[PDB]
Design a protein around this nucleic acid. Structure first.
Lengths: 192, 218, 47, 169, 134, 211
RNA sequence: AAGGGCACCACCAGGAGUGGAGCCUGCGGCACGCGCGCUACACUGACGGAGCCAGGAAACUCCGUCGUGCUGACGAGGAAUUCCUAGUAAGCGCAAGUCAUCAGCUUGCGUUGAUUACGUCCCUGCCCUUUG
């Protein structure tokens, strides 16, 4: 199939801080669209999926019960999962010199804490979401890796740029965004 | 005698903008204005702000303008425009402090709070406002830059040529030296006022005088 | 849209001539019409 | 959407110097004919965030802005945004540093627009006459743009924009 | 018979007399006025062929104000031309129609606009909240 | 531009004499002045800033640059100072005071090289130093307003013009009455001393086709 | 470095905007800093009576009172920087999550209802090659 396209939808309770998280996680590089309006009431998600031709969707919602909640949704049966994250105001910002950053390159993946869990869903999700183009040919020139680690009940999303020397040698430099996801409600597809 | 402000876009009037003004607070744990007397030691140490610290010029100019008849007659408003890009509107009825020490105190407070309020009235006396100056200016306003290297003019004559509904805005460099391009992007032309280099204050009297003559102010 | 040529009309029988236009440091397309100064290709236009 | 008529219905089918008329009641090059301007005069009025009363605004501004020395109201409104547009201002340079800014047209729909929300603005910014007649400032100022179509008297920057894009050219 | 951007106006058609009541009133009133015309301007709009006729009138109700107003709008002439022949014109009902829609947008069918959609974001829709992490 | 001094009694010049100048040193020496010596104290007799203000206003003028101006200062305690037209007075009050204090102690400020005296305490009265053809006038809110340009044009081709202005914040215009021919006003509004100075300079610059 | 592309999380054209203000809730500190906001500076208004109707809603329409006077902190905000191209933005509001009580949150949902563009130019990002 063609590369899956993503639609980011700000919910009724989406704010600035959560929107900043949407912008950094999503970007026109280039299989993505942003809307400043959206809802998860319904059939509405299926409606937006058809009219915008996006099989991946992210709803942005925040209440005190579920703060900074990002509901990842796939058109394919076996979908939704709520991932909530929060940031500290004290986190230093990395504004880019380390990463001259070619937009639209196939990211590398590393998953730490793979099992067996009913989760498996998360690994499936993020692999389907950010693996873009499926090619037989790969140029070995970089660039970045998406790392996901289980941390005694939260998933730690990190993004690093690769540097290589003759010392071995791979070294990593974090470029962000840095997110700790708290797992919420899940919906799974029927056997059919 | 109605007080003139940027809100009014129609009245014919003279506006002086003290461009490139040297206003900057200084920490020491108390605050004061960066100025060549106290801080010539420091400035030099840090290898710069050589005469970038001349708030007195601004102070001089202000007294000079507000003390002028054309101000008393209510046909003049002033604006400031800092080296660091801060823009101030000056309420024409403000009795600015006579001494530099007392001036400093008040400019330090204005800069930290963005406005100075009358103790009884709700109109501000000084107010930090948003650039560009050209939003706040009258709709039909002639704009010029005073410059030693520009064609010399007789202000009285320069003024009688203005449409009866057209204001005049003059940008003066409130500074000891520098290129007179602090306003190239806004002005229609540049003019000289004397064959002698002037000080900002003097340029200011000269111009007020001139308007005062031409607009019949005693 | 640097005004192209100024093919007026005879002598005193033209409120004003026409003038094509496109752009150099921006756009570029066919045109003519609205303006009645008297500059030239020395002068220019915008798009 | 969503205005009215009558109230005078003085439809001056002339007054339209330069281009303009080939877009005096238009939008396209990007609407179509967004009701003969006065649908945008009335619209550029929604600067708090909602039409109607805006609609009133317009209307009052009209009956007023014609009652007072009538020029067919609508033709004052046309002859308002008429002799009251920009005409080849500058726009950045890039050729320097530290630019400079050169000038030129003025894509008609511009000239109309850039003077529309403009006369609109000068109005909005009451502060003279800081009365209570929004439609007055909206009128007179627009009237001081019909009578004002005799200098200066409310627009002003009208000139400025142009009476400036000559030197730094 | 015609709904408008979340609103909806119903059509009454069978020949009668004067006083065409909207909701249960009189297109004299219709008091969310100001632009109270554009309602009396369908009937007025009859300025193209007819003068008023001698027929019927029905009630509207949906969404909110100016919505409804714009609804009752089509409602009317979207019901003068009513089929016909007992309503529209027993022949060539393009009489009105093409005339009552050579300057229309109400009887000129309805607008493909309709509220919905937001976003996991800020307000939602497209306006996604204002954030500026440092 | 050959420099004007009290010796030249012929040339037609304009002279401004800053009267009731507050120049009183305070032993600690520095200049006595409101800011520092507010507490120590009547504030009116201590406004040297006004003098400093006017000196800048005066020496910076086109007319002084054309060397047809002469400044004198006569304090509120009757000390008399001739200012040299070519002196570049300190721009800041602080530096001004250092200098002003020194001059009062030493009676003159000498150029580090030239024989000229940048500033000098001279003996009273001021009449023994002015030109022989010289109109004596006092500025006063309480007098008939005038156009400075008109007034200057009525002067004999030889007649100089000497105005007495009060370098004070408040008070009687009597300070020069024993010398003046006439008291006049330059404005309908009451002016600061320095502003009154500009007015005259500028009006006379105009009258004298300066420049 | 080169050469070239795409994008309102990037510019242009503007729109609304925070950053000033009061309180709000977070992250620090441990008098004070940084962020997401709420409501305000008022005459397109506030104020009372009244008209209606949404997925006794409010914004809103009318009739009348106040007189641009801190009236019935804060006089429109420095340097920065946010976001968005139409059933949008923007304003106004309610349902639901939260729950014994509690929403200045949030996901939603209707209500009024703009101005903007030839766009690619440059600043930011991304990319694709080549080139080391």
């Amino acid at each position: 199939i063609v590369d899956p396209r993503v639609l980011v939808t700000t919910s009724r309770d989406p704010s600035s801080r959560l929107m900043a998280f949407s912008k950094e996680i999503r970007l026109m590089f280039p299989t993505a669209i942003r809307l400043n309006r959206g809802n998860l009431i319904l059939p509405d998600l299926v409606m937006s999926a058809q009219r915008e031709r996006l099989s991946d969707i992210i709803l942005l919602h925040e209440h005190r019960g579920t703060p900074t909640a990002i509901t990842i949704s796939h058109f394919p049966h076996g979908p939704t999962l709520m991932a909530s994250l929060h940031n500290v105001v004290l986190r230093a910002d990395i504004p880019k010199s380390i990463k001259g950053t070619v937009s639209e390159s196939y990211p590398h993946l590393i998953f730490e804490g793979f099992r067996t869990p009913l989760g498996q869903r998360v690994v499936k999700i993020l692999k389907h979401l950010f693996p873009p183009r499926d090619p037989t040919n790969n140029a070995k020139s970089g660039n970045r890796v998406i790392t996901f680690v289980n941390q005694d009940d939260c998933i730690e999303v990190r993004h690093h740029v690769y540097v290589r020397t003759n010392y071995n040698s791979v070294e990593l430099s974090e470029v962000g965004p840095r997110f700790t996801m708290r797992p919420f409600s899940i919906t799974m597809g029927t056997l059919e | 005698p109605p007080v003139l402000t940027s809100k009014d876009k129609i009245t014919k009037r003279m506006i002086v903008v003290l461009a490139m003004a040297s206003l900057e607070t200084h920490k020491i744990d108390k605050y004061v204005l960066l100025n060549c007397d106290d801080h010539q030691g420091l400035l030099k140490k840090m290898g710069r702000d050589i005469s970038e610290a001349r708030p007195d010029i601004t102070h001089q100019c202000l007294l000079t303008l507000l003390d002028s008849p054309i101000n008393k007659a209510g046909k003049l408003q002033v604006y400031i425009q800092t080296s660091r890009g801060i823009l101030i509107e000056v309420n024409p009825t403000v009795r600015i402090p006579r001494t530099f020490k007392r001036f400093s105190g008040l400019m330090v407070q204005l800069l930290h709070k963005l406005s100075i309020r009358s103790v009884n009235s709700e109109e501000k006396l000084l107010k930090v406002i948003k650039n560009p100056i050209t939003d706040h200016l009258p709709t039909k306003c002639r704009k010029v830059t005073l410059s030693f290297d520009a064609p010399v003019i007789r202000v009285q004559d320069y003024i009688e040529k203005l449409d009866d509904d057209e204001s005049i805005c003059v940008f003066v460099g409130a500074m000891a030296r520098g290129k007179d391009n602090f306003a190239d992007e806004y002005v229609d032309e540049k003019v000289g006022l004397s064959n002698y280099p002037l000080s900002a204050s003097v340029a200011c009297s000269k111009f007020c005088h001139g308007a005062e003559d031409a607009w019949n102010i005693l | 849209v640097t005004l192209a040529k100024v093919i007026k009309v005879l002598g005193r029988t033209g409120s004003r001539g026409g003038v094509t236009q496109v752009r150099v440091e921006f756009l570029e397309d066919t045109s003519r019409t609205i303006v009645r100064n008297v500059k030239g290709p020395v002068r220019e236009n915008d798009i | 959407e969503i205005k009215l008529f009558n109230k005078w219905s003085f439809e001056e089918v002339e007054v339209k110097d330069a281009s303009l008329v080939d877009y005096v009641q238009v939008r396209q090059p990007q609407c179509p004919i967004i009701e003969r301007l006065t649908n945008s005069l009335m619209m550029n009025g929604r600067n708090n965030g909602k039409k109607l009363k805006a609609v009133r605004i317009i209307k009052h501004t009209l009956d007023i802005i014609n009652v007072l020395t009538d020029q067919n109201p609508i033709q004052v409104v046309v002859d308002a945004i008429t002799n009251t547009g920009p005409r080849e201002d500058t726009t950045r340079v890039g050729g320097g540093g530290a630019a400079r800014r050169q000038a030129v047209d003025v894509s008609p729909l511009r000239r109309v627009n850039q003077a529309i929300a403009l006369l609109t603005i000068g109005a909005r910014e009451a502060a003279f006459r800081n009365i209570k007649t929004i439609a007055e400032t909206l009128a007179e100022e627009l009237i001081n743009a019909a009578k004002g179509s005799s200098t200066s008297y409310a627009i002003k920057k009208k000139d400025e924009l142009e009476r400036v894009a000559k030197s730094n050219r | 018979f015609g709904k408008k951007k979340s609103a909806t106006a119903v059509a009454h058609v069978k020949a009668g007399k004067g006083l065409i009541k909207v909701n249960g009133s009189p297109i004299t009133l219709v008091e969310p006025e100001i632009l109270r015309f554009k309602v009396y301007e369908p009937l007025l709009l009859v300025g193209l062929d007819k003068f008023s006729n001698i027929d019927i009138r029905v009630r509207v109700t949906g969404g909110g104000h100016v919505s409804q107003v714009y609804a009752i709008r089509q409602a009317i002439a979207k019901g003068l031309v009513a089929y016909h022949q007992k309503y529209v014109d027993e022949q060539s009902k393009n009489e009105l129609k093409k005339a009552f829609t050579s300057y229309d947008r109400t009887l000129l069918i309805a607008d493909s606009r309709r509220p919905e959609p937001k976003k996991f974001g800020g307000k939602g829709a497209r306006s996604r909240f204002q954030k500026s992490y440092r």
